[model samples]
Target chain A: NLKDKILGVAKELFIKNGYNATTTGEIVKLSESSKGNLYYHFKTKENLFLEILNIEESKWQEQWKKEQIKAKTNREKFYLYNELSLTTEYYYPLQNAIIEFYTEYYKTNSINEKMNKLENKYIDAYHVIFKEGNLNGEWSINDVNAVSKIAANAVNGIVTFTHEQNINERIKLMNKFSQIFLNGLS
Target chain B: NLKDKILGVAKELFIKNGYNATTTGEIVKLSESSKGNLYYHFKTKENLFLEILNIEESKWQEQWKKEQIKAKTNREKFYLYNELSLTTEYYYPLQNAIIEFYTEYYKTNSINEKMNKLENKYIDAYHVIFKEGNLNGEWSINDVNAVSKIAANAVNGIVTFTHEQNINERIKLMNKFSQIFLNGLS
Candidate 1:
């Protein structure tokens, strides 16, 4: 329970001030927990941050899996994926904190292994979806790997730019991206 | 000469530590100049940072114009524009600083006027290139503004992701992006 509380506080702090800007002292103060207790739960601040990231990432993956399982048709699954992307349920302060963490992660080698693993997981998930569609003769991709890369990169691009614009504009851009991917120049 | 040195030093510091993390004292020490001299050239530290950003942005625009003028054909111009998107010479550090500044700027309404002006300048330059391509029949774009937004967002996406991958991989991704843009999946 205390660990959860500390993580909650840390997530809030990270979202507000970013990981590098927030200190362990501030985390302890905000969590209303002792420094020793915080360290007892997580060894270092970086470890604590990583633990929080892992939890958040798992939640995202689980949500996607649940959505994927609920869809009856391949087209519906793909559309569900797009719908989940457009949903505000997963877009919030935590996503912003992760983006901030990810940018710093990109600049340093400290978290490269973990970041690469996460990237591969998403890429693999994308490949599975595409592969399924291909098997059903609904999708035609010359190179599944390249398609995976483009899809992943485009989703990231859409999300990042969407955050910078108005919410209505973001929804419109998302729809445009969906059309571009599905109907290709049409 | 002193002002140039100060700006150069400030730019390096700002890139490494971000605009907020960097301090005036560090810039003064790195430039090997006194606070009095730094203040004489630029009234405040923010003013100095702003000057560096302005200088970098202007140089980028000028270089882009020169490249456009030298391009004899639409294909050459497209390739040159792709190369320009990948240019890390003067724009990378400035873009990084701007991203950091804008993250904070979004919280304060006071700086929106200046930020919007800079953003519009970037949009206009992108539009000029897009318009040229459309006019020359090199590219078929129904909505120049929308296509410009997508292309610009993709470039930003690639650059952001490149921070996590090797230079060779980044180059490959850029090539793939250019190929996709030139010949859409029909």
Candidate 2:
């Protein structure tokens, strides 16, 4: 019960203050737990933060799977993907932290391996929808690899721009991008 | 001479360690100047960082003007914009730092005014090329605003992806995005 309480409090702190700014002492204070007890469950601050991230990631994965199951066509699935992506404040917060972390990490370590894993997962998801659509003669794109990369990049761009602009403005930009992408493929 | 040295060294340190990680003492040591001298020149670390960013911003503007003049047509100008963006490593470093700073700045102060000014400058550059193409009867887009947003977003997407992927891979993605954006406008 104490561990769950600690995790919940830590999640709120991390979201508000960011990963780098959130401190162990603040978490202990917020959780109303003894320092020793907190350390007994999670050895370090990094471990606790990683646990929070992993739990959030699983929750998102579950939501995505549920959405995919409800959608019948590739077009529907693609739209669902965008809807899920647009709605996830959790995903965007985690992504912002990850970007800040990796920008520093890559300066010291080999970052390509980790980045490739993330990119491959993204590519796989898009490939599934494209392949299914092609099989049903609903998609016209000849090169899924190229389209996958383009789609991924465009989505990333939309996300970055959305951080700076209002929801209405973000959606307008996204629609323009979607139109251009669909025009090229269709 | 000492002020120039401090600014140059601080820019390098800020790019490597990021703004938060950088220290005034470190900047003084790197610049081979006394702490008193740095304080006299910059007043504070934030001021020092802002000075460097201003310098970088001017450099980018100058480069953009030169490139725009060299480009023969609207399409050529568009391509040059992409090429200039990809090749400008120095600008990327400063832009990344500015983004990080702006994220934190928005917490206490309103940044929308400053952001709108910057955004307008970017939009104006794109409009120049677009209007040129329209005058030449080469442009096909009816809605210049929508086309400009799409093209701008695509370039931004390519830059974001390039931070994660190789240069060649990013170029390929950029080409795909450009092809789609142009086709949509046409």
Candidate 3:
């Protein structure tokens, strides 16, 4: 509970003040925890930040796991994925902090490896959906591996480019994309 | 011709040493031109870099213009676009330089405005293609503008994410993306 308290406070401080500005002392001070405990929980400031990223990622996957079961088909699964992607609160909290952290601080291989792994999980979800669609004869896909990567990348691209748009606008844009991806132009 | 020679040499220097490291003195020295001549042509280092970016962009458009004319349909046009995007030397020469220029030197409104305009031209091409596809009954697209944006963003996204992959690998990825965009999974 004390470890979690430190994490919660640290996450907020980082979000509010950015990675470079936020200090562990502040996190411990705000959380009413000691410096020794904070150090005991996370060996370094970088470790603390990485833990938050991992936790944030886990939250998204956990949410997706619970919500995805309701969808009967891959099409519905994609739509649901888009909905969750647009509506999810997981990304915005750490958006600025993560940029600061990555851009200013840790450009480490292990960190990058972890980041890639997180993205791979999303791509892996697409792999499962594409495989299901092929089995169900919903689509005749020759290369599920390639298509899934493209699909994941496109979704990420769409999401990023439409960052300033409203939720309704995003939903509409994503729906159109989903339609285009599911059915051909011609 | 004098101006062009300066531009050509400056472009190379920027690419080789990046924006900050490659000074005006160095540009003129390596370019076999005078500092006054370089300044007369470009006015400022920022202007010089911006001119290179614009010229680089124009080269892509010029190449696309000649190539796109050969394609019989929007589908073929897209394939041609992908081929050009991957194969063209335009992006590679300035890739590192451009990143350094944007990251280290300038982040101005006028520059961002120019950058957006260039991207919009690509999106405009997509607009025209989507319209032609719809008019020709190749596809039944309800929102041309929105679909064009998504399509352009997806292409850009695929191109960027597959940057580390070889040309053949990138081509295969883009082709898969194009197929998905044109004909849906279902």
Candidate 4:
């Protein structure tokens, strides 16, 4: 309970003020835990942050597969991926904080494989969807890995590059990308 | 000139390290200038970096437009865009550093609008290509801005997300994405 309370407050602070900008003292104060308890539970702020990401990463997978069933058709599944990408809250802000962490503490080996794992999860999903589409004759792509990378790149582009753009603008952009994608499949 | 020397060295260090990680001290050392002279030529590291972006931005425009003449067909142009995206040296690293600059020293009012103008250049290029495709009856899309964003997003996605992937892997992915995009048109 105490650890989770710290994570909760940390997420709020980290997102609002940023991971680098936020202090451990602030996390303790906000979470109402003493410095000892804070360090005891989550050895370092980095650990605290990774814990949040670790948890949030699970949420991405957990929510995604269940969400997959909602899309009976492979085409609809792609749209669902777009929808979830836009709506997924923790992943984006958490990812931003993780980028800050990686940029700063890159010598530390804690993060090298973490992001790949997250990325692979998405790719795996794409793999399944693409495979399904191929078998069903909906989409005609055989190389799932290659196609997944392409899809991932486009989504990454929209997410990373267009953050400054308006929400409506991003949605519209995403819709067009989808049209190009689905239309291309046939 | 000392100014060009400064820009050249700064670009090297900034790209190799990072905007924040590379300091004025290092720039002066590498460029072999006195601190006074460095500041005299460039008011601050942030300004120096922005100037590099300005120059690099022009390079993007010049090379891109020239590259445009080679691709008479819109589909070929789209592939050329992808090829350039893979080959372009500055847009990737400089944009990463600019985000760092914005994140860290953003309050100075020297930077934000500059990067947007840079981004819009690419979008405008895409806008033109997509519009041409539509008029020529090759590509059919309702919203130029949205479609451009999508194409940009996907291309951006490939460029930023798949760097760890090998060159052949990247080329394969791009080919698949191009096929999808061109196929979607019909």
Question: What DockQ, on C-alphas, does every prediction get?
Answer: 0.32, 0.50, 0.34, 0.58
Worst 10 residues of 3 chain A by lDDT: A99-108
Task: Report the candidate with higher DockQ, 1 versus 4.
Answer: 4
The model with the greatest TM-score is 1
Supply the DockQ value of model 3. Answer: 0.34
Q: Is the docking of candidate 4 incorrect, acceptable, medium or high quality?
A: medium
lDDT at residue A162 of model 4 (Cα atoms) = 68
Per-residue alpha-carbon lDDT of candidate 4 for residues A7-115, written as tens digits (9 for 90 to 100): 8999989888877789999999999999999989988887788778777767877888787888899888887787678656324666556557656654455655665
Off by over 4 Å in 2: A1-13, A22-55, A68-73, A76-80, A90-96, A110-112, B2-5, B23-51, B68-73, B108-110
Give each model a TM-score: 0.79, 0.77, 0.70, 0.78
Over A21-113, each residue of candidate 2 has an lDDT whose tens digit, in order, gives 888899999999988999999877766766666676567667777868888888777666754565574246655555455444544334455
Per-residue CA lDDT of model 3 for B1-186, tens digit only, reads 688877887777765555665888787675777767766767678888777877876787778887798899787887778656777867445544553454344345534555556556657767887788877777767778888888876676676545544679888888878876777522
In model 1 chain A, which range of ten residues has the least summed lDDT? A177-186
How big is the positional error of residue A117 in model 3, measured in Å on the Cα after superposition?
Answer: 1.2
Report every candidate's CA lDDT: 0.66, 0.68, 0.72, 0.74
Residues B90-140, model 1: lDDT tens digits: 656545555556555565542444545545555566677678777777766
TM-score of candidate 1 chain A against the true chain A: 0.76
Return whichever of 2 and 3 wins on TM-score: 2
Question: Could you give the fnat of all candidates in order?
Answer: 0.19, 0.53, 0.60, 0.80
Which segments of model 1 are wrong by more than 4 Å? A1-5, A25-41, A66-91, A99-107, A161-164, A181-186, B31-51, B65-76, B109-112
